[PDB]
Amino acid sequence: RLFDKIRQVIRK
DSSP states (O other): OOSHHHHHHHOO
16 A cells, blocks of 8 residues: 555554
8 A cells, every 4th residue: 555554654
């Protein structure tokens, strides 16, 4: 993923 892979890092 180009966004999901980062989302998990966001944890907003």
